[PDB]
Design a protein around this motif. Structure first.
Motif, short mmCIF file in Angstrom:
data_model
loop_
_atom_site.label_atom_id
_atom_site.label_comp_id
_atom_site.label_asym_id
_atom_site.label_seq_id
_atom_site.Cartn_x
_atom_site.Cartn_y
_atom_site.Cartn_z
N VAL F 3 0.83 -1.19 0.00
CA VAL F 3 0.00 0.00 0.00
C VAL F 3 0.86 1.24 0.00
O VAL F 3 0.52 2.26 -0.60
CB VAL F 3 -0.92 0.07 1.24
N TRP F 6 2.54 1.97 -3.68
CA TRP F 6 1.72 2.22 -4.86
C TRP F 6 2.20 3.41 -5.68
O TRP F 6 2.29 4.55 -5.20
CB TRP F 6 0.30 2.48 -4.41
N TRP F 14 -7.16 1.64 -7.57
CA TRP F 14 -7.90 1.74 -6.34
C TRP F 14 -9.15 2.59 -6.48
O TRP F 14 -10.25 2.14 -6.22
CB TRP F 14 -7.03 2.35 -5.29
N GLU F 65 -9.62 1.07 5.54
CA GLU F 65 -9.91 -0.23 4.95
C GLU F 65 -8.68 -0.75 4.21
O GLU F 65 -8.68 -1.87 3.67
CB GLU F 65 -11.08 -0.01 3.99
N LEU F 66 -7.63 0.06 4.17
CA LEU F 66 -6.39 -0.29 3.48
C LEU F 66 -5.26 -0.60 4.41
O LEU F 66 -4.81 -1.74 4.47
CB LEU F 66 -5.94 0.83 2.56
N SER F 67 -4.78 0.43 5.09
CA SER F 67 -3.70 0.25 6.05
C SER F 67 -4.05 -0.99 6.90
O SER F 67 -3.30 -1.98 6.89
CB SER F 67 -3.63 1.48 6.94
#
Lengths: 68, 67, 67, 68, 67, 68
Positions: F3, F6, F14, F65-67
């Motif tokens: 992440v 990117w 995304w 919702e990513l990290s």
């Protein structure tokens, strides 16, 4: 010399005594009297400028180590 | 004796727990020997530790130090 | 009884703590007796108090009032 | 009359009841229903116009003093 | 399930709170189901809501949605 | 693919992945690298052009919702 009667300068020594002289300033500005020390809480220290945990701890434990 | 562990003494310990990835902050925050002995969940949270399994690993590594 | 301290009753108190330099705001903010009893670190910060040793002095002067 | 069902005017009394009539306006404009009161936080009051701490406190405590 | 409420699903909800007067913006801002669940005082302020009693009404209508 | 690594085009996916393709432009112009995303704050988004709350939220939550 009662821990609770430490004038602002009395506290100062103490810190200098912990090799935390670098904090004598704020602790003095915030009129940190003897008694005040006795109730500092993590936050007070954070508001008081202390941030390196090892120092809050050092200060905090320097306290239980006092009253007691 | 832990009670006098310089900031670098602590470092080893962490590395002994395979928590080397924390040697930084623990060093920045001048985490002396004695300090360890009193870290509380919050201190670790302030210290950057978050993976519970690590806070626990560190905390128990402490109980497993004084006792 | 504190519970009914008019704004001026509070004033004395502060002056009793040698915190007379705060009698102003404490008066402007219509800090009645009861109000004191619930001041929280923030209220003091909003009230202008900043020297920790003072917030503490005031806060303990309160614990040292209800109890 | 359930604290939670106070129409906007019901609240009004309350404030008037605390001698905080001078706030009946905003409290009315912001459609501060019964329930709303029950959750006002320092900020809501600040947004609601209240500033004299002694009043936020007065209002805030008038609240715990309600639900409870 | 809220988690998938289309922009129109949300609309009902508001209308269920008698906050129909907000169905507009909530629709313009493409306030999907999930979005609601995270609105914070600011989002509402950006969303146009201002009468506290309404921000609260909406915010609690949310706590009163997830839980 | 971390992440945090990117490239600007990674981010793009995304967004396209959130059906927010209409933002791929700016997000690209502002050289929004992986890591950058991880710290966008309401304001960054406002500066970044996003305005429909439901989108800032959508983007913002797409982040935790990513990290995590």
């Amino acid at each position: 010399r009662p821990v609770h009667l430490w004038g602002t300068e009395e506290v100062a020594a103490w810190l200098e005594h912990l090799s935390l002289c670098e904090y004598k300033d704020i602790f003095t500005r915030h009129d940190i009297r003897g008694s005040g020390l006795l109730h500092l809480e993590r936050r007070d220290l954070k508001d008081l400028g202390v941030t390196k945990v090892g120092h809050m701890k050092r200060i905090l434990c320097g306290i239980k180590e006092l009253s007691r």
